[PDB]
Amino acid sequence: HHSQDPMLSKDIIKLLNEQVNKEMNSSNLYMSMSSWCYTHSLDGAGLFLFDHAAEEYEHAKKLIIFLNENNVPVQLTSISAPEHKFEGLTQIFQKAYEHEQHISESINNIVDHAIKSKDHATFNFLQWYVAEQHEEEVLFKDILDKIELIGNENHGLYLADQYVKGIAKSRK
Amino acid sequence: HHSQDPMLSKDIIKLLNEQVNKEMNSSNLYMSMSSWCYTHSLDGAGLFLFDHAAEEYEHAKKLIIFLNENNVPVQLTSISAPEHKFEGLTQIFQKAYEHEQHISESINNIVDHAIKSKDHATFNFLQWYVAEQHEEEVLFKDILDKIELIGNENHGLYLADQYVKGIAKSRK
Amino acid sequence: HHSQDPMLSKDIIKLLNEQVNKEMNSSNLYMSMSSWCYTHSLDGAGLFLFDHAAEEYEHAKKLIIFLNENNVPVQLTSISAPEHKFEGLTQIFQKAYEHEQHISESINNIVDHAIKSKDHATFNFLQWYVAEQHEEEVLFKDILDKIELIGNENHGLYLADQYVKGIAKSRK
Amino acid sequence: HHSQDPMLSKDIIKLLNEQVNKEMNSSNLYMSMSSWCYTHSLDGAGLFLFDHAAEEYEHAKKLIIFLNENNVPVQLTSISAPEHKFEGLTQIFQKAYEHEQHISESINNIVDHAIKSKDHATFNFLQWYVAEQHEEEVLFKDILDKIELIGNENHGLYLADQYVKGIAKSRK
Amino acid sequence: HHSQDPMLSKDIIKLLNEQVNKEMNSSNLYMSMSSWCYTHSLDGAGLFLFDHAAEEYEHAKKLIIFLNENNVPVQLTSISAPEHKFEGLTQIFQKAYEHEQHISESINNIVDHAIKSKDHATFNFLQWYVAEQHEEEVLFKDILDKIELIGNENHGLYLADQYVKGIAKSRK
Amino acid sequence: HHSQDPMLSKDIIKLLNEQVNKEMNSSNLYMSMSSWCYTHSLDGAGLFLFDHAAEEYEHAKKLIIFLNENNVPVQLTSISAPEHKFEGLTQIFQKAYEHEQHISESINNIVDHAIKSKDHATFNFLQWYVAEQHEEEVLFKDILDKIELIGNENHGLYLADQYVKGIAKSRK
Ligand SMILES: [Fe+3]
Ligand SMILES: [Fe+3]
Ligand SMILES: [Fe+3]
Ligand SMILES: [Fe+3]
Ligand SMILES: [Fe+3]
Ligand SMILES: [Fe+3]
Ligand SMILES: [Fe+3]
Ligand SMILES: [Fe+3]
Ligand SMILES: [Fe+3]
Ligand SMILES: [Fe+3]
Ligand SMILES: [Fe+3]
Ligand SMILES: [Fe+3]
Ligand SMILES: [Fe+3]
Ligand SMILES: [Fe+3]
């Protein structure tokens, strides 16, 4: 039987499929970062990062749904193993903030290509994703700011972790 | 600062980490099977398999939580690209049922090792997982049975897909 | 059309089918014991034993459902006629307690074989059945204890029967 | 101690005891037919026949209650192994309908004997049973009619099974 | 008058009675640890450990009930005065965590023997106890992790005690 | 760091700590007596004595709280195993009543010493304990009176146990 062709252009298909794989990779990285925190007495950051990992996977699913609805084949590639070696809480959040900046940039690129191609169905679709990503980037900036304000001397790590614990709990 | 050692034995830790990666692999395979269905006018099976993919990831998360609570580092490996080319609905569900049999066997292996190790905290933890996996395996057996009963003649594909659509909607 | 093979091993199939037939036999025995009590002015024990008979049949049904769901043929054999000759209330409950001990042993055997075969779907399934059987065995032990404490002199049979009547009513 | 004699005549007692054993036999036959369906991808008929088997046992219990209340010893015989090999859905429902005709006739015989004996307590007691059996006989007539109308061609079996599934679910 | 024999095997009886006594002794140890904290300005840990002592006695009672229901004589042994001298908060929780590990191991031993014995009534009964003990062990690991993370420099002891206080209150 | 001295006098401390241990001893004694009843078909007395044992431990806990709040070290001592061999229901309740008289006497002694010491915080605190112990002593007098009224003979033991069972349940 005949099924309708993909409803999106080849370039937009490529960018969206790449994005699904970025979000899956991201999810694995945050699970790894979360585990590091949990195994180093930082269960506040552990919880926060675990919940954030699950959220990135929710983004991958929503992108997959959009590809499905447009009759676009989902192309899952090999998801490379995430980094597991970390130095401490500050380095984890520095790496995470830089990672969120890269994710924001990748989304801005898809949205820009949608504009150039005149694919306004995709432009309109991606708006929740732009908004939620901006909120996540700001969140990591704020937590990093706080970790650096507190510092790691004289029970600072505990204070930072409790601070993050409070954020994690308020968000669920 | 000193954090407590992993609370589980090395063998149990390795099997559980392997199981996490099994469920992630599973989730990707089912997303790919789902996509195939969606792009071949089988949105009932597409939905069913998408929701099943998501459920497998939920199992991975639950295993991760148990690892975190026991101070066990989570070791996420590379996730390999899933199969993406399929012959049809029957082949997909034959493959899927065979896959679910393998998953069931893999869980039985962990539970067996927990008994042999006298790790009854892990034995007890795994009971929800044994139960839910059994229900999933029976489900795939039932769907495969139905696809085979209906046949692909005439509008058999439509009929099988609608039947799977009904199951997908009922399980939400 | 092709239907999937039985999902359980041959040994577990045999033990489970035998158990369905044990529970059906048990149900008939309790109906017979119940009738003896009713026709000898012991309507308390009559009711209790009737309700217990119906419960054993409910166990047979739940086992049948599990066999059905695993695509395992239910093999009902000839159910031999139950004993009908009884000496009195004490002998009925002595026989019944010994019978419940045999039923408990038979269930422990299936669960042990599930462990040996690594069939943890069946092990997990049987847990309600282990729990409910233990409660029933304890119940018969308690009633037997009470019948022997009261004794059969000077309206003791009436007191024992009213005691059992109270238990029967509280359980429904 | 002296207990009152059976409150019913010998002929009525024998017919009622025979009817109890008829319903137990019936229940087993239907469990076996149900199993056949479940193991041949007909879970709609499997469910319908399982629930019907259970209902026949409920009739046996109700007859037992009446016997107990009249101080009539219940005589449970050996229950013979039911037929387990069947040709298909149509043959099962042909056999089942014929079986229900025989059950209806057997009840008519008891009611007739009650009239001839002037046993109007038994006549009156049996009215729920006459009524419910008539509804059961009509049901099997209707299902057989539908199976024959649909046919087994193409996906006829699927269609008939789904129709029976709908009836099974509606009767709960 | 004759009472029924104990319903459990001699080895299971010995292990269960030993466990009752272990829980009683645990309650004493925790009361003593609690008192140390209350008398050294650590009312957070004081409260936590008092409430935990009380919960160990609740375990002893649940074990006693199971022995009673099986007609197994409870054999309470002599109590030896618990340790009353401690060095500080950290040492108390190090000792406590080590104690909880010993308790977990002792339960795993009973569960293992129940398996080897084919005593699945006992296996099944112990499952709440396995699950609750694992939760207690994890809790003591978490608290010790937090105590080590905070330190006793500056007002570290205050912060750690306040942390434990919050946990004690949240568990009520 | 400096913690405040005990707020009670040395003599009052000694008597209160001895009292904690008396209550602990009572708990054990009543658990043992309870077990004897349960293994000799007297589940009414079994339940009554078990619940009483638990209530004695509640008294110990309440005394412990008062010591803690006053910065008084809890001094839990070695206690002999409780008696495990008994002659029968009457002898158990005679021993128990005698025991309750001794406990009452021990409380009166502390209250007396509080008056003499002008320790009215302690006098005031103990009033619930005086009141509850008086009720318990009266209760054991009433049960013993009833046991002696009923007698051992001609199902008297059963009647006495059912009577105690009613009290056990009414007290919740
Ligand atoms: Fe993000
Ligand atoms: Fe994102
Ligand atoms: Fe699965
Ligand atoms: Fe799974
Ligand atoms: Fe039973
Ligand atoms: Fe049973
Ligand atoms: Fe019928
Ligand atoms: Fe009928
Ligand atoms: Fe059709
Ligand atoms: Fe514990
Ligand atoms: Fe414990
Ligand atoms: Fe008292
Ligand atoms: Fe007292
Ligand atoms: Fe009397």
Side-chain angles (χ1 to χ4, degrees), chain B residues 74-93:
Chain B
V74 176
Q75 306 193 36
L76 294 181
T77 64
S78 302
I79 311 298
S80 38
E83 300 206 304
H84 66 282
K85 299 187 304 283
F86 301 98
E87 290 177 6
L89 183 70
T90 305
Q91 194 218 31
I92 287 171
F93 279 86

mmCIF file of all heavy atoms in Angstrom, chain B residues 74-93:
data_model
loop_
_atom_site.group_PDB
_atom_site.id
_atom_site.type_symbol
_atom_site.label_atom_id
_atom_site.label_comp_id
_atom_site.label_asym_id
_atom_site.label_seq_id
_atom_site.Cartn_x
_atom_site.Cartn_y
_atom_site.Cartn_z
ATOM 1 N N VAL B 74 26.564 4.497 38.286
ATOM 2 C CA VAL B 74 25.841 4.040 37.115
ATOM 3 C C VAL B 74 26.821 4.122 35.964
ATOM 4 O O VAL B 74 27.439 5.181 35.751
ATOM 5 C CB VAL B 74 24.598 4.917 36.812
ATOM 6 C CG1 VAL B 74 23.927 4.470 35.522
ATOM 7 C CG2 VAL B 74 23.598 4.872 37.972
ATOM 8 N N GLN B 75 26.975 3.008 35.242
ATOM 9 C CA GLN B 75 27.866 2.927 34.086
ATOM 10 C C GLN B 75 27.065 2.831 32.786
ATOM 11 O O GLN B 75 26.674 1.742 32.384
ATOM 12 C CB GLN B 75 28.802 1.721 34.222
ATOM 13 C CG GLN B 75 29.596 1.689 35.526
ATOM 14 C CD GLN B 75 30.722 0.675 35.513
ATOM 15 O OE1 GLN B 75 31.366 0.451 34.487
ATOM 16 N NE2 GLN B 75 30.976 0.062 36.666
ATOM 17 N N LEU B 76 26.819 3.971 32.151
ATOM 18 C CA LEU B 76 26.094 4.016 30.896
ATOM 19 C C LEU B 76 27.072 3.827 29.739
ATOM 20 O O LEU B 76 28.080 4.536 29.630
ATOM 21 C CB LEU B 76 25.324 5.335 30.762
ATOM 22 C CG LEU B 76 24.179 5.569 31.762
ATOM 23 C CD1 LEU B 76 23.504 6.902 31.499
ATOM 24 C CD2 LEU B 76 23.154 4.449 31.717
ATOM 25 N N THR B 77 26.780 2.848 28.892
ATOM 26 C CA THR B 77 27.650 2.524 27.777
ATOM 27 C C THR B 77 27.139 3.245 26.540
ATOM 28 O O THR B 77 26.134 3.962 26.609
ATOM 29 C CB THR B 77 27.690 1.004 27.517
ATOM 30 O OG1 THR B 77 26.390 0.553 27.126
ATOM 31 C CG2 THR B 77 28.112 0.253 28.758
ATOM 32 N N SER B 78 27.836 3.075 25.418
ATOM 33 C CA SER B 78 27.308 3.526 24.132
ATOM 34 C C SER B 78 26.034 2.745 23.824
ATOM 35 O O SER B 78 25.963 1.548 24.081
ATOM 36 C CB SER B 78 28.334 3.317 23.017
ATOM 37 O OG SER B 78 29.543 4.004 23.315
ATOM 38 N N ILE B 79 25.016 3.423 23.307
ATOM 39 C CA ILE B 79 23.791 2.737 22.912
ATOM 40 C C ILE B 79 23.897 2.570 21.393
ATOM 41 O O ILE B 79 24.115 3.542 20.676
ATOM 42 C CB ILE B 79 22.499 3.516 23.366
ATOM 43 C CG1 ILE B 79 22.559 3.923 24.852
ATOM 44 C CG2 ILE B 79 21.226 2.713 23.084
ATOM 45 C CD1 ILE B 79 22.651 2.762 25.896
ATOM 46 N N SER B 80 23.815 1.340 20.897
ATOM 47 C CA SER B 80 23.996 1.115 19.462
ATOM 48 C C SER B 80 22.759 1.516 18.662
ATOM 49 O O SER B 80 21.642 1.461 19.165
ATOM 50 C CB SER B 80 24.383 -0.338 19.190
ATOM 51 O OG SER B 80 23.669 -1.206 20.055
ATOM 52 N N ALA B 81 22.974 1.954 17.427
ATOM 53 C CA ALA B 81 21.885 2.315 16.535
ATOM 54 C C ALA B 81 20.958 1.102 16.375
ATOM 55 O O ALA B 81 21.431 0.007 16.090
ATOM 56 C CB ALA B 81 22.434 2.752 15.187
ATOM 57 N N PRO B 82 19.642 1.287 16.602
ATOM 58 C CA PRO B 82 18.712 0.161 16.469
ATOM 59 C C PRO B 82 18.483 -0.196 15.008
ATOM 60 O O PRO B 82 18.697 0.652 14.137
ATOM 61 C CB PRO B 82 17.412 0.714 17.057
ATOM 62 C CG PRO B 82 17.494 2.186 16.821
ATOM 63 C CD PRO B 82 18.950 2.532 16.988
ATOM 64 N N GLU B 83 18.039 -1.427 14.750
ATOM 65 C CA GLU B 83 17.518 -1.801 13.431
ATOM 66 C C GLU B 83 16.455 -0.794 12.987
ATOM 67 O O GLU B 83 15.627 -0.355 13.794
ATOM 68 C CB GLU B 83 16.907 -3.207 13.456
ATOM 69 C CG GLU B 83 17.894 -4.297 13.843
ATOM 70 C CD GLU B 83 17.536 -5.662 13.281
ATOM 71 O OE1 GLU B 83 16.398 -6.153 13.525
ATOM 72 O OE2 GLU B 83 18.410 -6.252 12.600
ATOM 73 N N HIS B 84 16.483 -0.427 11.710
ATOM 74 C CA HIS B 84 15.538 0.556 11.193
ATOM 75 C C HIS B 84 14.754 0.077 9.968
ATOM 76 O O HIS B 84 13.712 0.650 9.630
ATOM 77 C CB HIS B 84 16.239 1.890 10.918
ATOM 78 C CG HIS B 84 17.243 1.835 9.810
ATOM 79 N ND1 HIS B 84 18.500 1.293 9.972
ATOM 80 C CD2 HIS B 84 17.177 2.259 8.525
ATOM 81 C CE1 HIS B 84 19.164 1.380 8.831
ATOM 82 N NE2 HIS B 84 18.384 1.966 7.939
ATOM 83 N N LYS B 85 15.253 -0.968 9.314
ATOM 84 C CA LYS B 85 14.561 -1.558 8.168
ATOM 85 C C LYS B 85 13.801 -2.808 8.594
ATOM 86 O O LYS B 85 14.354 -3.709 9.225
ATOM 87 C CB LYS B 85 15.542 -1.888 7.045
ATOM 88 C CG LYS B 85 16.289 -0.675 6.476
ATOM 89 C CD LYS B 85 17.132 -1.040 5.243
ATOM 90 C CE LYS B 85 18.152 -2.172 5.522
ATOM 91 N NZ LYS B 85 19.365 -1.717 6.290
ATOM 92 N N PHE B 86 12.523 -2.854 8.247
ATOM 93 C CA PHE B 86 11.664 -3.971 8.629
ATOM 94 C C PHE B 86 10.833 -4.398 7.431
ATOM 95 O O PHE B 86 10.640 -3.617 6.499
ATOM 96 C CB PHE B 86 10.784 -3.583 9.826
ATOM 97 C CG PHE B 86 11.573 -3.182 11.057
ATOM 98 C CD1 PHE B 86 11.805 -1.836 11.342
ATOM 99 C CD2 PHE B 86 12.104 -4.151 11.912
ATOM 100 C CE1 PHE B 86 12.550 -1.462 12.463
ATOM 101 C CE2 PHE B 86 12.846 -3.787 13.039
ATOM 102 C CZ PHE B 86 13.069 -2.443 13.313
ATOM 103 N N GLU B 87 10.361 -5.638 7.449
ATOM 104 C CA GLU B 87 9.618 -6.194 6.321
ATOM 105 C C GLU B 87 8.132 -5.861 6.399
ATOM 106 O O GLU B 87 7.457 -5.749 5.380
ATOM 107 C CB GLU B 87 9.806 -7.715 6.235
ATOM 108 C CG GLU B 87 11.212 -8.169 5.821
ATOM 109 C CD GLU B 87 11.373 -9.690 5.824
ATOM 110 O OE1 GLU B 87 10.363 -10.414 6.032
ATOM 111 O OE2 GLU B 87 12.518 -10.171 5.620
ATOM 112 N N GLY B 88 7.616 -5.711 7.608
ATOM 113 C CA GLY B 88 6.185 -5.509 7.777
ATOM 114 C C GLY B 88 5.774 -5.644 9.223
ATOM 115 O O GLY B 88 6.607 -5.930 10.083
ATOM 116 N N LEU B 89 4.482 -5.439 9.473
ATOM 117 C CA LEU B 89 3.906 -5.517 10.820
ATOM 118 C C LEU B 89 4.167 -6.853 11.524
ATOM 119 O O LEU B 89 4.538 -6.875 12.699
ATOM 120 C CB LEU B 89 2.398 -5.245 10.759
ATOM 121 C CG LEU B 89 1.616 -5.223 12.081
ATOM 122 C CD1 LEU B 89 1.979 -4.005 12.903
ATOM 123 C CD2 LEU B 89 0.120 -5.248 11.801
ATOM 124 N N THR B 90 3.948 -7.968 10.817
ATOM 125 C CA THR B 90 4.146 -9.291 11.415
ATOM 126 C C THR B 90 5.601 -9.491 11.857
ATOM 127 O O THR B 90 5.849 -9.918 12.983
ATOM 128 C CB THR B 90 3.689 -10.430 10.473
ATOM 129 O OG1 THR B 90 2.332 -10.199 10.084
ATOM 130 C CG2 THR B 90 3.762 -11.779 11.179
ATOM 131 N N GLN B 91 6.549 -9.161 10.979
ATOM 132 C CA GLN B 91 7.977 -9.288 11.293
ATOM 133 C C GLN B 91 8.370 -8.421 12.489
ATOM 134 O O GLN B 91 9.108 -8.867 13.359
ATOM 135 C CB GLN B 91 8.853 -8.944 10.078
ATOM 136 C CG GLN B 91 10.325 -9.378 10.229
ATOM 137 C CD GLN B 91 11.318 -8.376 9.651
ATOM 138 O OE1 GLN B 91 11.077 -7.164 9.641
ATOM 139 N NE2 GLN B 91 12.449 -8.883 9.166
ATOM 140 N N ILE B 92 7.879 -7.184 12.526
ATOM 141 C CA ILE B 92 8.112 -6.306 13.673
ATOM 142 C C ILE B 92 7.648 -6.967 14.985
ATOM 143 O O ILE B 92 8.409 -7.034 15.951
ATOM 144 C CB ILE B 92 7.491 -4.907 13.471
ATOM 145 C CG1 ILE B 92 8.325 -4.124 12.441
ATOM 146 C CG2 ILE B 92 7.424 -4.146 14.810
ATOM 147 C CD1 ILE B 92 7.716 -2.822 11.973
ATOM 148 N N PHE B 93 6.414 -7.468 15.015
ATOM 149 C CA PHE B 93 5.909 -8.093 16.248
ATOM 150 C C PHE B 93 6.529 -9.461 16.584
ATOM 151 O O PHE B 93 6.609 -9.825 17.760
ATOM 152 C CB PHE B 93 4.372 -8.048 16.333
ATOM 153 C CG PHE B 93 3.870 -6.715 16.809
ATOM 154 C CD1 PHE B 93 3.656 -5.677 15.905
ATOM 155 C CD2 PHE B 93 3.698 -6.466 18.164
ATOM 156 C CE1 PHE B 93 3.244 -4.426 16.343
ATOM 157 C CE2 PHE B 93 3.285 -5.215 18.612
ATOM 158 C CZ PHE B 93 3.056 -4.193 17.701
#
